[PDB]
């Protein structure tokens, strides 16, 4: 089916690879060449996840756990029961996430939009690629990746944190947390302002950009404007993921002690050493 205004927009063009061959829709979904590759990697990766569950101890959704190999295998592919299945699924996930980004570019090109969405999603792909590729590769073993399991990856996060005794003291982590918290605040403010001028109390005219700028101005002391709040939201949300990737890649490859003792440089500034 189509939105009442949609049909006019469904032209050919804007593809990156396939030309007209895959330039069609399936229900609501645009396909394209990277749609085909997406569904390939999604299906293969999903069915291998189901196989991992089948050969594991339970079907309980929360307890399924497909673990990476032991560190002794280094950068080789382990036996599939022993973590090689995790390594294949990781390749499928990279293939799927990459295909999804490039498919979004084909869609943006067909609509004459800017490329912002593909790149903003690249911030998440960067963070994933850091956790499963870049950081494991710098540590010299694929076994440093997180396990694929709804709670077992939380056991990994816990243990990686305490590998540095008190992970809250990681300075890039403090920045990343600040971005996540500031983003959620900014999202609530922006959502509230737009809804408050479009849904004023009954018997009140629809509001205006002037009213939301006046309200925003006496909240923060300055008016950010309509383009400004969207630039800020993009900056905060994507900046959180980028600082997240930094905070985890410095932990291990570049810093090995507890994080609290990193702050020794601040105590030793010569003005007060």
């Amino acid at each position: 089916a189509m939105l009442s205004f949609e049909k006019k927009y469904r032209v050919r063009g804007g593809t990156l690879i396939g030309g007209d061959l895959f330039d069609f829709w399936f229900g609501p979904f645009y396909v394209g060449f990277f749609g085909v590759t997406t569904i390939f990697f999604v299906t293969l990766g999903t069915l291998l996840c189901v196989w991992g569950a089948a050969m594991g101890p339970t079907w309980n959704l929360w307890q399924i756990n497909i673990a990476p190999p032991d560190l002794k295998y280094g950068l080789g592919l382990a036996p599939l029961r022993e973590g090689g299945l995790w390594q294949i699924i990781t390749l499928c996930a990279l293939g799927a996430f990459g295909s999804w980004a490039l498919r979004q570019a084909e869609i943006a090109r067909k609509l004459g939009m800017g490329m912002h969405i593909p790149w903003a999603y690249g911030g998440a792909i960067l963070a994933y690629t850091t956790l499963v590729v870049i950081r494991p590769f710098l540590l010299g073993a694929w076994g440093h990746g997180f396990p694929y399991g709804i709670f077992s990856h939380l056991d990994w996060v816990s243990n990686v944190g305490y590998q540095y005794l008190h992970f809250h003291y990681n300075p890039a982590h403090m920045i990343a947390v600040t971005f996540f918290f500031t983003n959620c605040l900014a999202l609530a403010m922006h959502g509230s302002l737009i809804l408050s001028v479009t849904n004023p109390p009954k018997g009140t005219p629809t509001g205006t950009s002037e009213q939301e700028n006046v309200f925003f101005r006496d909240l923060l002391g300055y008016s950010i404007g309509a383009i400004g709040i969207h630039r800020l939201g993009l900056f905060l949300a994507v900046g959180a993921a980028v600082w997240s990737a930094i905070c985890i890649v410095i932990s291990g490859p570049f810093w090995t002690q507890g994080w609290p003792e990193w702050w020794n440089w601040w105590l030793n500034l010569p003005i007060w050493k």
Binding site: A1, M2, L3, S4, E6, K7, P205, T206
Partner: protein, 62 residues
Amino acid sequence: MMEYIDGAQIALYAFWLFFFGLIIYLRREDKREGYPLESPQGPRDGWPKGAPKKTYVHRDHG
């Protein structure tokens, strides 16, 4: 006394019932524009059925 049922489990299902109710509400709101859908088989609503298209009253100025 109930061994398995506990107050954290009860509270969690209360949230799930609310949250699915919320998703239904949000999907009705998502359908105020562009619906009903055009199709070869005639108009289509999906599910849930969208809320009606909303009229906005502008101000008389001063």
